[PDB]
């Protein structure tokens, strides 16, 4: 359709107005004393949230040029959420500061591309300084402190996440989902477990708990649809002679074979249970081979040149306990050599290194956890559903921040690390005067998060900013208790990855946004 | 539908208004100090661009006569993009200058057809002068300079493209795609490679890298669907006696034959890998014949009169190394006579000479690169997605400019070549006074790009243009560093093809736009 | 729906307003100094045309009585384009002049039917005078001059058309298509050629050019389906004994016969190529019989009572060379007696004389051209697409004018022939005074084209008209150089057919339009 075309300062003013609208909506939720935003939903009740990307993803304006400005600045928060899972409000605050100062410098007669180059140079130097300023985060106390800070100063969430990380291990998986009561609970599983249960209720040998218990059984791993029992007679006779229980993992067991097995169980001849293989497609084969490696067995498939009639005792894996119930199967203390397990997990790790999407990496890491580490689930408890959603979001944020701190270390929080970096970069110079102006723009915009944090508390940002800048090291301002001190001692920690990512994406979007001269959109 | 008819000066005023709207939208992005344009997208985020055709393709006007003018001038940029891939803003600037001066002459009582004829004569003479003025671009330093200038003065892109062109050769192919990191990378693959992987995971003999590696194999090229093992026993027996691996490139293999092959693999009988033939249809046959000529083998086809059971060791190709992964297959150092490869590439070159669509030519050039040269891929790295899109567009422009400069030579940049040509054409004359006026119109319009480049810098175009006109040779004006000097020494190079194409298309459209007397369009 | 009814002078002024609008849109493009008209297209870009019928076909008006007038006067241009292919602006100018003068006469109280009868009488006498005034046009110089004049004074177009007409001969056909370069080229084909290529790439015996070449082949013409080699075997063995190649033109060939033929090809047994028959249906039989009578063979069909298995060397045609490629087949120097060719072309001529649509006549003419003369194609080259379209239209107009001038002769151009005729018809009288008034109306309207040509030049039409009327013979006015002289020596020629058609159609529509008294249309 027809277009509307604007040039120069008019387009820049519309774009800045849209950016300011989105940023002012988002920045009320920053810090320990930030407040909540209510977001209307078409299908359901409103959501009360304190998360920056959640607020940013629903801001849209009726003016089309202002909406273009807002849509451009929204990508900073979206990309920060995708990268680190935290630090999105800080990214938006930095982007708005850079855009405002850059437009003010452009209107003074500077070349926008030289300003962009200066911003790029300052940001590269700042990221180098941040990496040199980081400190490792290894003890459980520091992980608890990071999880507490990220969950809006909540001691219990940090303590729970620290305990979960301690029990599960370095190669495990922790997940968050909705609970039932009013308290948080942590359920950890050791060993391997998949969401497939027994195929016949008569298999139950312990009616008290409604579960199948087997002691030191054999595991028959068959990559084949089992329908006729005639294929199953040799191994059945073998295990009957041996006298130990048998577990059959296959794609399915049909009516007559299942009937034969169940009839044989309750007569005291053989102790048999049968469950279906987990997953759909090639992943089924992968986890079948994982179980085979764990229990020291062999997968009986027709694509390798084996038939189940020829299966013998050494082809059956062995475990210590198998617990099957209506929904889950658990294999406990599988008998398998450590070398094979390490080789398999190494193969999965190098497979992880060559994965693109999040879904594949999550599945592969879950497989590594099943083979080697553990899997935990955190249940969030709240009285109402809105409180449940808000607490679940906070817990997920704390989980992400603790992970990032584990990979890349921690720096002093509260906006002090960026101030220290900007004070260190005071002698950085570029090629020409416009690049110097851009460097100064970036360095001055690095002080925005602390000023906004102090502003949300109702105090005077300039006095606090000058007092913090007058110090050195980890000297900072505690916004919760309104006192100065050492932020490392007070337990106010931020991951280096979150800070660095926020700075990088903010600069990347803002530098491009500064250079606009013309702006084209549809007519009202 | 009912129409609106407008005559003479009113029609010309509306047309010039539309042309001016589109040209002023496009011309803010010209030079080293041009800026960006934000284009609103219905599906997604806004697009920030500096490319002329991208801006031109979006402009539309609500008035209908003005929209006719804009739609008519848009074809200059479209044609320049399709022909050379670069120089669209310069073409638009030249078109607008010619249209403005020509309408000014027509309003003074000149015959538009004679003005058109004079403009065409001047443009023909100018193209001859430009061809007489160019210089070869053969060493890598000049290629780097051209790629740097065409990428908004980005040295790294120019050096990367120079290295890629050095490695991949004269007959190679270079493509640009999205990366994942923050740094650009170049990955060149030598030899022939196709994107078809192994047909069964059990074929892998190197689990550490997950690759199927074979040393000096036989290659069996079956242009048919392989159904039963029985058709293959003679070949397998011969290869097993021979004692070296065998690679089966066929249309596909089902469960039975593949099961037999895989069973034989790990038993130590014969080392065999199977992959699917690349392509779909006739191109599949062409690729199979290319592999046959490269490796020195024969394709087993029913339409030629041979069967798989009759195949011998003479119909099998040979190589030195074959590496297969989950997605790619690589044939390294095929053992074949160079004469056959030269004949095949000459035949494909002849096929190229009679190729119309660009897709077919691209596929044929990729096939020639596989046979004779290499394939290089440049992966662009950026922090966000808008930055990625801009960097990718600039890298593509630099690639096109370097190709054009290699094929046709380079002239002085900055709009200096056009000014030198116009100064050389100072005594050209036509048959009557209107033709002379048209010649002068074209000569005056040839100075527009330099004036616009100086205008975007905040300088005065008149003084700079006069000073440049006062010099001779490669003397010019550097807009980045704001000084005068030799354009060749300071590295501002422009392909002759881009300049010539821009001038030709601009004149071709502007001359016809000048001769309009009536306009017919729908009612509002 | 409800109707609106207007009576008398109101209806007549509405009609004249519509006529004036369309004619003023059209007449700006008349003469050597007429201009271009931009026509808006809903799907694509606007077209810049100088063709009168093209301008007329897109005129429609919001008012409904004015739209009736425009829709009525549009038929003159449509009919003139359909008949002669040229001279539509002149027809519209004549129609408007007649309508204006006739309405002026009617307003003075004269019977419209008598005016119509007088106009018809005058036009009949004028057409007789035009037929008597013509001179033959057979020289290549005169054909070049006609093509130059009709192509808007383009020497190259006239020269190219003259050369093409000389090469193809009297009975040949010439077509115009889009070229690829910037220069026009002429591509003439000698012999017979049809657009069917080889059925298998392995028939190629010259792979440097990728074409099949046979020297002194045998041509097997079979109007049947061939799938099994059993009915093909005896003639194949006979050809193998003969020792010379064979070309099979049939309906098509299935896999069995094609595989057999190709298998015998590269073994050196028989040099065989197979193609499909041209055409679909009865026309396919017609071209099969044409090839048979050209090469001196017999068509094998079931509907005549012959079988392929019974074929001998007598039923096989013979040629001197056959070249086949991906798309075209050419038979060079067929061995046939010219009496058969003459009889066949005579049969097709009598078929031509009894053809209603132009499409069947075009196919029959192409068949005669393939039998006797040649087929040429002119490729029009231009830089852009708008220039391409306008140049192609001009070339087609020049081709139409050249054919018409060959058919019926030439007269002096610039509107001088009509003036001479009108001067010769000064003594013509009717039955009553109103018929005499109608005759004078027609004679006055015959002077409109020269007046409009002079008006488009910026000169004063009345003085030029009187000076031309004062002369005699071919004395006229040259609007290109603004000079008087002999129109024949200056090279300004028009076909007699075009002038006669324009006059006839203009008078035919205008006479009816004069006699209106009431108009009935829908409500606005
Ligand atoms: N008690 C505190 N004193 C000072 N600063 C704090 C305190 N708690 C948190 N902060 C700072 O406030 C910021 C929290 O902002 P938040 O609302 O979580 O937005 P984001 O989505 O960017 O994390 C952190 O960067 C942290 O440095
Ligand atoms: N440093 C420089 N000094 C002077 N002129 C330059 C410099 N760099 C590029 N140019 C000129 O600017 C033009 C580049 O225009 P650009 O914005 O790339 O549009 P396009 O490539 O579409 O024509 C070229 O004609 C080139 O001669
Ligand atoms: N050099 C010339 N001097 C005078 N008359 C000319 C000249 N060239 C062409 N003409 C006249 O102009 C007319 C061409 O008008 P044109 O635009 O072709 O309209 P049409 O569609 O009726 O052919 C011809 O009738 C021809 O007699
Ligand atoms: F404006 Be061009 F695409 F460099
Ligand atoms: F306008 Be006509 F077709 F010469
Ligand atoms: K927040
Ligand atoms: K540009
Ligand atoms: K015309
Ligand atoms: Mg956080
Ligand atoms: Mg460019
Ligand atoms: Mg004409």
Numbering used by the authors:
A (entry chain B), B (entry chain C), C (entry chain D): 2 to 525
What do the authors say?
We performed a similar in vitro analysis on encapsulated MetK, by both cryo-EM and cryo-ET, for comparison with the in situ cryo-ET structures. Encapsulation occurred following the addition of GroES and ATP-BeFx. For visualization of encapsulated SP, GroEL–GroES chambers were processed for cryo-EM structure determination. Alignment and classification showed that around 40% of GroEL–GroES units contained density for an ordered MetK molecule close to the equatorial region of the chamber. The remainder contained only a faint, smeared-out density, representing empty chambers and chambers with incompletely folded or misaligned MetK. Class I (around 40% of particles) contained a strong density in the chaperonin cavity, corresponding well with symmetry-averaged folded MetK (left), whereas class II chambers (roughly 60% of particles) showed a weak, diffuse density (left).
The bacterial chaperonin GroEL cooperates with its cofactor GroES in assisting the folding of roughly 10% of newly synthesized proteins, including proteins with α/β topology that fail to fold spontaneously. GroEL is a cylindrical complex of around 800 kDa containing two heptameric rings of 57 kDa subunits stacked back to back. The apical domains mediate substrate protein (SP) binding and the equatorial domains mediate ATP binding and hydrolysis. ATP-dependent binding of the lid-shaped GroES (a heptamer of 10 kDa subunits), capping the SP-containing ring (the cis-ring), results in the burial of hydrophobic surfaces on GroEL and displaces the bound protein into an enclosed chamber.
